[PDB]
Amino acid sequence: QTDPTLEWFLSHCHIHKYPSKSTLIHQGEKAETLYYIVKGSVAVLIKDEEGKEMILSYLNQGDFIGELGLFEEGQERSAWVRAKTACEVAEISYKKFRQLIQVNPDILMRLSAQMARRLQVTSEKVGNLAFLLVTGRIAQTLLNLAKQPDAMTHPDGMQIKITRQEIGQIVGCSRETVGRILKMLEDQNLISAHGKTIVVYGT
Amino acid sequence: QTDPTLEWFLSHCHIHKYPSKSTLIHQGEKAETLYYIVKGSVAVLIKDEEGKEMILSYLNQGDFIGELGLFEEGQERSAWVRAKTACEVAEISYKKFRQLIQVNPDILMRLSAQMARRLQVTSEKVGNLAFLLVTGRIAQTLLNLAKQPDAMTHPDGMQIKITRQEIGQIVGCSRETVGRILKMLEDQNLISAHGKTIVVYG
Numbered sequence A: 001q002t003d004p005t006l007e008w009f010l011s012h013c014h015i016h017k018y019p020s021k022s023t024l025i026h027q028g029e030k031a032e033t034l035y036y037i038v039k040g041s042v043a044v045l046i047k048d049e050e051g052k053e054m055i056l057s058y059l060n061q062g063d064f065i066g067e068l069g070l071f072e073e074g075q076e077r078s079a080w081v082r083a084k085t086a087c088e089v090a091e092i093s094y095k096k097f098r099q100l101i102q103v104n105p106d107i108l109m110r111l112s113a114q115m116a117r118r119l120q121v122t123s124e125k126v127g128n129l130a131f132l133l134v135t136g137r138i139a140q141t142l143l144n145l146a147k148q149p150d151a152m153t154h155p156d157g158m159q160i161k162i163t164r165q166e167i168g169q170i171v172g173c174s175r176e177t178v179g180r181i182l183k184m185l186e187d188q189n190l191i192s193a194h195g196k197t198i199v200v201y202g203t
Numbered sequence B: 001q002t003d004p005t006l007e008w009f010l011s012h013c014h015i016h017k018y019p020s021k022s023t024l025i026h027q028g029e030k031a032e033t034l035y036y037i038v039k040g041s042v043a044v045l046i047k048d049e050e051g052k053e054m055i056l057s058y059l060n061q062g063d064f065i066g067e068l069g070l071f072e073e074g075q076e077r078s079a080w081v082r083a084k085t086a087c088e089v090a091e092i093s094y095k096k097f098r099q100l101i102q103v104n105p106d107i108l109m110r111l112s113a114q115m116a117r118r119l120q121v122t123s124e125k126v127g128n129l130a131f132l133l134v135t136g137r138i139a140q141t142l143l144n145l146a147k148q149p150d151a152m153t154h155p156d157g158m159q160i161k162i163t164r165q166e167i168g169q170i171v172g173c174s175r176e177t178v179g180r181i182l183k184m185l186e187d188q189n190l191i192s193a194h195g196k197t198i199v200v201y202g
């Protein structure tokens, strides 16, 4: 079971290998290139006002990078992209990709499908104004605990001792809701959680 | 002022009119369509825990519905779609649309642009801890104002009066951070903003 459409597309791309931690795309770069991840994983990241790194999302094999620029012709990169693992990345100009689409739209279907599957996950994960309020209070709770005397110093920030159940009691939501928000914050490079302890970054 | 490709796409569609509040796509519908709003607006809804109505998207003229199922045909989700206003919606089978894509990929491009903009909106929610707290305090401030006696009844919820500087001064953040948060809240379909006037939904 070969993939004729993919290898056709790939022959039109410049394929380069990036060691882990190397930067593929810099913030502010003119967006004129579409990327396809042949192998490996990347992190899409932005910075704080104090220059601390936050992860918008991870992109894996089969994902494209820079799809928005293909349609919106502004256009400067909003995010750095850095190799999470050693990766192989295919590169094509927007101009070349637009002519290929005309000839074989299956490759547009490929690009569209992987966006759609990424949209699906959050089709679920929603939350209203209340959930956003709860999120604020959880952050408040974590920030305040990291400031208190009984917080332990950690290479990545300040370590605090609190369960998800206790956060939920304070903030007025279920421990399941806390789990989801904590997992989100950990995915985003804002905290780490292990056992009953949480490391709040930057503090 | 002519869009021949759209006319071509629409000639392959069945166009239906829906009065406001009427359902377009029911819960658990096996996904095989592909909708295009010709006129008006719709709401995408889900029930939360216990069973209260919640908005996933407000979609307007030129927007697609059912575009995620195009790449996952047969999909059943718990969401449903309702007419916000009187609307006119073109529908087409995924099967037929796939035949059209080979001829002219332009409609798939418009659909994909919508999906790409949505991924970008989702990215703008991130999100440091201080930021998330400020966001919650801003939401809190708007929500409490909508509960006050001097709030006005609006079809979409409660209409309140407050400036961006007033919000910033109260909460303790820059005017730039207030703009960023209100925009985020509007993109999340939680409020609408028009000058001093803010409508808090629900």
Ligand code: PRO
Pocket: B023, B026, B027, B080
């Ligand atoms: O379940 C509901 O609430 C909506 C009402 C119309 C059809 N589905």
Ligand code: PRO
Pocket: B004, B005, B008, B103, B104
């Ligand atoms: O160019 C195309 O592919 C179709 C033909 C008629 C309208 N647009």
